[PDB]
Amino acid sequence: LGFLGAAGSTMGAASMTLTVQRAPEAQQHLLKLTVWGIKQLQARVLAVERYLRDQQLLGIWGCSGKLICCTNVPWNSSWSNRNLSEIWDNMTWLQWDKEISNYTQIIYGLLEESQNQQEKNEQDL
Amino acid sequence: AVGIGAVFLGFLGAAGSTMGAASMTLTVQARRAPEAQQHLLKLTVWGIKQLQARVLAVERYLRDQQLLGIWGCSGKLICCTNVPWNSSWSNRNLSEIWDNMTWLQWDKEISNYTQIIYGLLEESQNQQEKNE
Amino acid sequence: FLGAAGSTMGAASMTLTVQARNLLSEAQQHLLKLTVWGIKQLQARVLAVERYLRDQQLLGIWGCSGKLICCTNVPWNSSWSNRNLSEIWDNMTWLQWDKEISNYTQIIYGLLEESQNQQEKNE
Amino acid sequence: QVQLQESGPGLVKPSETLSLTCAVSGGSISGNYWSWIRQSPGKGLEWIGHINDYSGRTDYNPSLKSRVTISTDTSTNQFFLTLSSVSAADTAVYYCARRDTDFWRGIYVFEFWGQGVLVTVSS
Amino acid sequence: LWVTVYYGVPVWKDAETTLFCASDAKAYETKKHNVWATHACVPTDPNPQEIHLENVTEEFNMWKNNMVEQMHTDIISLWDQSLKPCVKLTPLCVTLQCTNVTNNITMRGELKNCSFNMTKVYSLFYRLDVVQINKEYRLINCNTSAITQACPKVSFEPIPIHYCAPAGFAILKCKDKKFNGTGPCPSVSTVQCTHGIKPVVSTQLLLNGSLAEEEVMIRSENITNNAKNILVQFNTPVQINCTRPNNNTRKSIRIQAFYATGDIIGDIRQAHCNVSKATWNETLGKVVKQLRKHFGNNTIIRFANSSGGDLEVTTHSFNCGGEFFYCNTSGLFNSTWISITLPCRIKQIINMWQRIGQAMYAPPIQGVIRCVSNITGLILTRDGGTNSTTETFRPGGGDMRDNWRSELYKYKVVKIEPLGVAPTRCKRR
Amino acid sequence: NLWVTVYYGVPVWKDAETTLFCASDAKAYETKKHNVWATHACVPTDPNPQEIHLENVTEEFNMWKNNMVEQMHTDIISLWDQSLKPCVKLTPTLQCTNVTNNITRGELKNCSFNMTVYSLFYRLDVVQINKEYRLINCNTSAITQACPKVSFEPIPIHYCAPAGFAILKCKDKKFNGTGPCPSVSTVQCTHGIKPVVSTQLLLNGSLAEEEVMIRSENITNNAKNILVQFNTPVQINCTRPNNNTRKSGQAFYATGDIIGDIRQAHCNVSKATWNETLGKVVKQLRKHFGNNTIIRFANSSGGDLEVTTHSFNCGGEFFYCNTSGLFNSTWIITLPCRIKQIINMWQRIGQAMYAPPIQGVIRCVSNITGLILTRDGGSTNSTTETFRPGGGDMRDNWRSELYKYKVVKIEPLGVAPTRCKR
Amino acid sequence: NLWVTVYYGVPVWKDAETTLFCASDAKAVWATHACVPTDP
Amino acid sequence: SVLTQSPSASASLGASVKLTCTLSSGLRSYTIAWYQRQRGQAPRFLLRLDSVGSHTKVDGIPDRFSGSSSGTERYLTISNLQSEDEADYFCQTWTTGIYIFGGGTRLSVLS
Ligand SMILES: *[C@@H]1O[C@H](CO)[C@@H](O[C@@H]2O[C@H](CO)[C@@H](O[C@@H]3O[C@H](CO[C@H]4O[C@H](CO)[C@@H](O)[C@H](O)[C@@H]4O)[C@@H](O)[C@H](O[C@H]4O[C@H](CO)[C@@H](O)[C@H](O)[C@@H]4O)[C@@H]3O)[C@H](O)[C@H]2NC(C)=O)[C@H](O)[C@H]1NC(C)=O
Ligand SMILES: *[C@@H]1O[C@H](CO)[C@@H](O[C@@H]2O[C@H](CO)[C@@H](O[C@@H]3O[C@H](CO)[C@@H](O)[C@H](O[C@H]4O[C@H](CO)[C@@H](O)[C@H](O)[C@@H]4O)[C@@H]3O)[C@H](O)[C@H]2NC(C)=O)[C@H](O)[C@H]1NC(C)=O
Ligand SMILES: *[C@@H]1O[C@H](CO)[C@@H](O[C@@H]2O[C@H](CO)[C@@H](O[C@@H]3O[C@H](CO)[C@@H](O)[C@H](O[C@H]4O[C@H](CO)[C@@H](O)[C@H](O)[C@@H]4O)[C@@H]3O)[C@H](O)[C@H]2NC(C)=O)[C@H](O)[C@H]1NC(C)=O
Ligand SMILES: *[C@@H]1O[C@H](CO)[C@@H](O[C@@H]2O[C@H](CO)[C@@H](O[C@@H]3O[C@H](CO[C@H]4O[C@H](CO)[C@@H](O)[C@H](O)[C@@H]4O)[C@@H](O)[C@H](O)[C@@H]3O)[C@H](O)[C@H]2NC(C)=O)[C@H](O)[C@H]1NC(C)=O
Ligand SMILES: *[C@@H]1O[C@H](CO)[C@@H](O[C@@H]2O[C@H](CO)[C@@H](O[C@@H]3O[C@H](CO)[C@@H](O)[C@H](O)[C@@H]3O)[C@H](O)[C@H]2NC(C)=O)[C@H](O)[C@H]1NC(C)=O
Ligand SMILES: *[C@@H]1O[C@H](CO)[C@@H](O[C@@H]2O[C@H](CO)[C@@H](O)[C@H](O)[C@H]2NC(C)=O)[C@H](O)[C@H]1NC(C)=O
Ligand SMILES: *[C@@H]1O[C@H](CO)[C@@H](O[C@@H]2O[C@H](CO)[C@@H](O)[C@H](O)[C@H]2NC(C)=O)[C@H](O)[C@H]1NC(C)=O
Ligand SMILES: *[C@@H]1O[C@H](CO)[C@@H](O[C@@H]2O[C@H](CO)[C@@H](O)[C@H](O)[C@H]2NC(C)=O)[C@H](O)[C@H]1NC(C)=O
Ligand SMILES: *[C@@H]1O[C@H](CO)[C@@H](O[C@@H]2O[C@H](CO)[C@@H](O)[C@H](O)[C@H]2NC(C)=O)[C@H](O)[C@H]1NC(C)=O
Ligand SMILES: *[C@@H]1O[C@H](CO)[C@@H](O)[C@H](O)[C@H]1NC(C)=O
Ligand SMILES: *[C@@H]1O[C@H](CO)[C@@H](O)[C@H](O)[C@H]1NC(C)=O
Ligand SMILES: *[C@@H]1O[C@H](CO)[C@@H](O)[C@H](O)[C@H]1NC(C)=O
Ligand SMILES: *[C@@H]1O[C@H](CO)[C@@H](O)[C@H](O)[C@H]1NC(C)=O
């Protein structure tokens, strides 16, 4: 968690923001503090694990690290063709994801195939 | 049960398979307790232990990834380098190694020279980046 | 660990890997002491790992993506202590260099990010 | 140089908690000791309590242990005093001060005092 | 051509690393409170990540394994930690005036009622437990031993314990039913957590043991060499029903509340175990058949009872309900082959794990103590040898690591190193 | 024209604070079985110091205003309260009479109280009320008590730097106490730092390796304390020639009958060695003040008893030694000690930690390494400068051991103008 | 002639079921022993 | 233990005034500190004072302020009184972790 503040804004603003981006033992109610510490470290470890898996996906898509990565598979017509200005200027990221949620698996498959082909024909010559 | 150890077991998922088959499998695989009595505090201790196990998994994975990144590989599963393979290392041709033997036998034959291989890889990456 | 921390720029630049690898290293009340100790130790290691990952992310924003000796396209303006390249590279230790550059780090980071983004978008 | 500036309600009716916030500028980064003191009108002043800025350990006068709670806020460099169940006799001029860290022959003094805020208990 | 690295590659390296225990959820959650066998170990996953491998053959060697030593050390430390909170019996070391009880005779009773002046208090002891001093009697090891008594609340009983390799390791498991435990194993599976292991103390017999599929198995590092032990794993577990026909009461004498045995309710008889004759004969037939297979048909297999040495190895030592029986097998292994009621006693001062350190005093058990157990494993010491005449297999054992090695015979701890390199026709631009 | 390149192995560091985690030496497993002061389940990890000398680098240390001493002081208080907390609170008028057998003024009082009995107390732990005697802090501070099975005693407690931080140290022998240190070296885990918990003198301290070291923020200003470190420690030896029983729901502990002669522990110190050490001290002081000013050593000015006397721990008891004799000289062997049970240890209201009586003699040997000296007024220009001992804030006692350490966060990321493009 | 680009870091969330554990305030009425305390 | 001291005192401008603070019998050798509070301004720490008159100093205060000790009495002496001396001066001490303050001498100057 933590990066939910930018939600509800335009993809332009969201993209710009993401580009920029000793306790003693005398404390009362010790059990609550230690249990919620367990929970917070659970959250942080799950965050780092999720980040690692996402970075593995980005690497298999030929991006390794990076945030704004660019690729080579063209945008098909069936994936909700719209005017780019109103796509990137008025609506918000959540609505766009809800609109494209039906197609993300095909997007990922085509992206992986395109990156694999790019690796193959780059190592060819 | 969850974390990165499962990823390591998935890496183990096919050990005796063909070299090419193993590489393809690697590419494919890249992607309320009842608490009857005095179980809450034992659950806290078990949580500490499970977090430390998961952190050990994460640190081992990160150390391996950093070792891969020291050379010219960044974070790619399969990686290609630019240091020649001298004939001293398994002079016999590549068809037998890439079709017949499993990874185990190749590792047994390479473990004697893996250190010098790593040294050559690191030196070659350093030279390639310095020259560029 | 620090290794040749105080040595000349060249030796430190040739021995970066050492620091790079070193940076990523019951009865009721007795049970509570044990779990507080575990909290402290796990918090320490998790914060170290997260700081390492944040540094890796910063490298990834630029054209490094984990590579140690990176190389970018940002021109070196003379305003950031313009001196002889060899003289800078064989006389001053890393510490003095960073102490006399700590006034311009933010602008360098911003220029690096902008240049990398511009290279991505233009092509 | 350490500067203490305090604020809070001026008029407080009987029988609730009085909350006073004292901010500080230029205080030491850690190891500080922030003390709340009050002076009743026409009577010698008395010590309320004090907080360790690092440890989080608090301490209060024995005759005001239950009714007084002092909390800290490192992020904004502030500390809050909460006086539960304020009576009519608790009207006073309140000072937030910093107690020294020298212990010269068996004394702790407050070098830096606040400007003082008058709190009066009325209907 | 050039060289390419392959991160995410199946690699194995035989290396030893510390493993953490895993108690079953029902082992501790259900009823067990204040028992040594379970502690703050991490509960196991609901279902292990058992993945079956194909076309892989790994070399196993239990006699050079490291899990057995690791688990023996864990059991030692756990037992010591369990015994530590209890109060010592150091003041008890004093001259005792003993007379042997004649209330009932079974095989004499051998008990002694002893008076000690702890400023005259009576107590009951067993003949093996106390030695005469020159009538005056003294505890067997109280002069030069830090004697200790177990806590009254804690109980001794096997509880399943799993071993899970930490992250970055794996447990290779030989699923081959026909596997003597040395050399290649045709079918090698991989696990994270091992199957249930119950820490049970026993000599010349394996109680609560894991039955082996297929036929009876014979295992040894060196059949030819006399010194090496031999493990025998039956395919059909043998029932044993053993009971001490006596009831006792506990007297709380302050030194520190020492618990002393009281007078016995009614009759007094020495303990007895029971084993069916036909099942024993059939199991012995299978065992001698397999041993002849390892020795030739013309070989003659003979048996004999124990050859002596201490008392915890000659007899069959085992704890039942909190009472440590040392039950003889003098008559079980008395049969010559060609091509039963066990009378037995108790000793309340025991030297666990064969060390001269602290010896634990068995607390009394009230009422009749009876128990059923699964004789599934035999420990045999080959007779010396003169050649091509016969072979004798008097039982031996006593080494607790040998007992552990039967349960952990099909596991090895392996370090996975997924950073292999390979050569190929690929050059980076 | 040069180009910017970023390196991620740079050894640059910058100072920062961090909660260092304690780690006692291995052998504590043999002592922690007694549930002693010596650490707890709070990370008793086995340490292994691996010093690595640096070169050509000078770091500006400042032992004053160093966060690590505050951190470890908080850690020690936490450890103390963790050990004390499980024990039973006392929460109790006592009729007292003057009883003595072979003493000498008799401090001991035979207090009596009725419960549904008799004990011996000390004058330092009781006050007259209106004879009627009531122990101090009766209705204000929860007196509490210590479990006699804790047997608190100092142990080395190494501090190991966390994963991302480093602990520097000043190997320079003649450490100034502030400013640059030309001999700096990184260390994974600090040395055997010991909880001295002693006042006005330093017991089982750290010795120096040249002339006795003087250190202070100012040696000029008389407000700030002055820390003195020795080279030839002087021994202090004495016993507790007494024995007392333990009384007894009403889980109350107190004193019992006394066996043998009754007399206060006089304690002893070698006089010639003490004079030699004071001569070294004055020789060092003349360097910072001038080779002609008259120097004096009077006794503590006054105030709380914890600053007037020299308070130290010994075998589960606490001794408050009158230190008038030791600090008494003017330049150009025995010292009476009292004993009391309620201990306002770290000047904290609400904690007393009633010490259970000890049974038998102890004879703790403790050899002194450090002094805390506070100057007097400077009205007499160049005439004389008196150096009465004092202090009592344990932060100084622990700054005596942490003067050669500093926690630094590694800042591996760096930039450099090389000649290479992409 | 548009092209896909991945934007890791975007604040997108989706509704999804899970197993909320508990939170209570009383001391371990209800069984409450499986309920963790709540002073965050 | 109570810090008994004179409730009020005053003197003419330009003269020297001698404020007094008398310790209790149980605080014979205790050291004290002097606090000055002018009208409205924050209380300003002046100086500590011990059994033999050895007094510390602080920046930002005139050197005219002086301290002296005599057994169970501590005297704050001010020379060359100015108009800014209109204030309340009180003595403070620290026996245990509890501070003990005086009643406050309202010191005034005559114009
Ligand atoms: C394993 O199996 C072997 C048989 O192969 C058993 O060995 C026999 O054990 C019995 C006791 O159970 C022995 O009987 C004892 O004999 C001792 C020697 O005297 C006679 O026997 C020898 C031959 O061993 C002859 O040479 C001699 O002429 C005698 O005929 C006696 O001294 C013993 O008496 C002592 O013990 C008994 C019983 O407690 C007491 O009542 C006596 O007062 C005295 O203390 C006893 O009579 C027999 O001799 C053994 N034979 C062999 C071949 O060893 C093992 O007992 C059995 N179990 C183990 C653990 O080894
Ligand atoms: C540091 O060294 C100095 C050296 O002078 C030392 O000063 C002396 O202290 C002792 C006590 O510690 C003084 O003895 C007292 O003197 C007063 C003088 O009136 C007597 O009245 C005292 O007797 C009564 O005291 C109380 C009333 O005042 C009664 O309640 C009590 O019951 C007694 O009956 C007592 O004898 C001594 O006078 C001074 N020296 C001088 C010259 O005044 C100082 O104590 C040392 N400090 C430490 C911490 O050791
Ligand atoms: C400075 O360091 C020295 C040592 O370097 C230290 O002296 C040590 O003091 C302790 C306690 O005062 C001694 O420990 C005791 O010694 C006596 C006499 O040998 C023993 O009888 C004691 O055994 C008891 O231990 C438990 C303590 O409660 C009891 O519960 C138990 O039943 C035993 O009866 C105990 O070991 C220690 O021997 C000395 N060491 C030396 C070398 O003299 C000194 O105290 C330190 N100074 C300080 C801390 O101010
Ligand atoms: C192999 O597994 C067997 C499973 O039954 C083991 O038998 C059991 O052994 C345990 C101790 O390890 C006993 O536990 C104690 O037993 C005594 C006496 O048992 C009687 O009372 C219990 C409790 O009511 C009852 O469950 C039994 O059926 C008997 O009626 C009790 O007094 C103790 O409280 C405690 O339960 C089991 O009772 C005992 N069960 C029986 C009857 O077999 C056997 O010991 C294992 N083999 C070895 C030696 O490891
Ligand atoms: C260590 O103690 C010295 C004592 O001299 C501190 O020096 C302080 O320095 C400042 C200016 O450098 C002094 O302010 C000026 O003082 C003179 C006479 O002293 C006065 O005529 C001026 O009007 C001005 O006020 C100050 O008095 C002096 N003393 C203090 C502050 O006690 C020095 O600051 C101390 N060390 C540290 C690290 O602070
Ligand atoms: C179990 O049987 C296997 C059969 O392969 C033994 O493995 C080899 O057995 C041959 C004799 O048949 C020996 O010459 C080899 O030296 C053995 N190699 C190994 C793996 O040790 C294995 O030794 C037997 N293990 C026992 C004795 O239990
Ligand atoms: C450390 O030594 C000197 C004097 O003893 C003081 O620190 C500085 O040292 C350099 C060179 O040694 C001098 O050029 C500076 O003038 C010194 N500064 C000051 C303010 O004197 C310092 O007094 C000593 N440190 C301590 C803690 O006394
Ligand atoms: C003076 O005190 C020091 C305090 O450390 C003593 O040093 C210890 O001495 C014991 C005696 O064997 C050693 O076991 C410790 O390892 C020493 N500790 C350190 C940190 O050095 C010293 O022995 C005392 N006496 C002297 C110096 O004569
Ligand atoms: C601390 O010790 C000094 C010794 O120097 C004590 O001073 C003595 O006090 C008695 C009390 O009546 C006088 O009779 C002596 O004449 C004093 N001697 C000196 C040399 O001053 C002092 O009283 C002791 N203080 C405490 C609190 O024990
Ligand atoms: C033991 O009992 C027997 C009777 O079976 C008796 O003869 C013998 O004297 C007894 N032993 C002692 C030491 O009294
Ligand atoms: C032990 O033997 C009995 C014989 O009936 C059998 O039922 C049981 O499964 C065996 N093992 C166990 C689990 O007790
Ligand atoms: C506590 O006892 C002291 C003894 O002098 C007394 O002054 C004080 O008033 C008492 N406080 C209460 C609340 O009884
Ligand atoms: C101690 O000092 C005082 C003055 O401070 C002096 O009168 C006395 O004689 C001294 N005592 C010794 C033993 O030197």
Author numbering:
A (entry chain Z): 520 to 540, 557 to 660
B (entry chain X): 512 to 542, 557 to 657
C (entry chain Y): 522 to 546, 560 to 657
D (entry chain I): 1 to 52, 52A, 53 to 82, 82A, 82B, 82C, 83 to 100, 100A, ...
E (entry chain A): 34 to 139, 150 to 162, 171 to 185, 189 to 309, 315 to 321, 321A, 322 to 397, 414 to 459, ...
F (entry chain B): 33 to 124, 128 to 139, 151 to 162, 172 to 185, 189 to 306, 314 to 321, 321A, 322 to 396, ...
G (entry chain C): 33 to 60, 68 to 79
H (entry chain J): 2 to 9, 11 to 27, 27A, 28 to 52, 52A, 52B, 52C, 52D, ...
Authors' description from the paper:
Compared to BG505 trimer alone (~310 kDa apparent mass including glycans), incubation of Ab1303 Fab with trimer at 22 °C for 1 h resulted in a complex with an average molecular mass of 370 kDa, equivalent to ~1.1 Fabs per trimer, whereas incubation at 37 °C for 1 h produced complexes with an average molecular mass of 443 kDa, corresponding to ~3 Fabs per trimer. The cryo-EM structures of both Fab complexes with Env trimer showed three bound Fabs that interacted with the CD4bs of each gp120 protomer. The binding sites for Ab1303 and Ab1573 on gp120 were located in an area that is surrounded by three N-glycan patches: the Asn363gp120/Asn386gp120 glycans located near the base of V3, the Asn197gp120 glycan in the V1V2 region, and the Asn276gp120 glycan near the bottom of gp120. The epitope of Ab1303 comprised 1430Å2 of buried surface area (BSA) on gp120, of which 879Å2 were buried by the heavy chain and 551Å2 were buried by the light chain. The heavy chain CDR 3 (CDRH3) of Ab1303 makes extensive contacts with gp120, including an antibody residue Arg100BHC that is stabilized by neighboring Trp100AHC through cation-π interaction, contributes a salt bridge with gp120 residue Asp457gp120 and hydrogen bonds with the Arg456gp120 carbonyl group and with the Ser365gp120 side chain, forming a stable interaction network. Residue Tyr100EHC of CDRH3 hydrogen bonded with Gln428gp120 and Asp474gp120. Residue D368gp120 in the CD4 binding loop, which plays an important role in CD4 binding, was positioned in proximity to the Ab1303 light chain and excluded from solvent by adjacent CDRL3 residues such as Trp91LC. The Ab1303 contacts that are buried in a closed trimer were contacted exclusively on the occluded, open trimer by its VH domain, which buried 286 Å2 of gp120 surface area that would be inaccessible on a closed trimer. Despite Env trimer opening, the gp120 V1V2 and V3 regions in the Ab1303-BG505 and Ab1573-BG505 structures exhibited only minor local structural rearrangements in which the gp120s were displaced as nearly rigid bodies from their central positions in the closed trimer structure. Thus, the Ab1303- and Ab1573-bound Env structures revealed an occluded-open trimer state distinct from both the closed, prefusion and the CD4-bound fully-open trimer conformations.
HIV-1 Env is a homotrimer of gp120-gp41 heterodimers that mediates fusion of the host and viral membrane bilayers to allow entry of viral RNA into the host cell cytoplasm. We characterize Ab1303 and Ab1573, heterologously-neutralizing CD4-binding site (CD4bs) antibodies, isolated from sequentially-immunized macaques. Ab1303/Ab1573 binding is observed only when Env trimers are not constrained in the closed, prefusion conformation. Fab-Env cryo-EM structures show that both antibodies recognize the CD4bs on Env trimer with an ‘occluded-open’ conformation between closed, as targeted by bNAbs, and fully-open, as recognized by CD4.
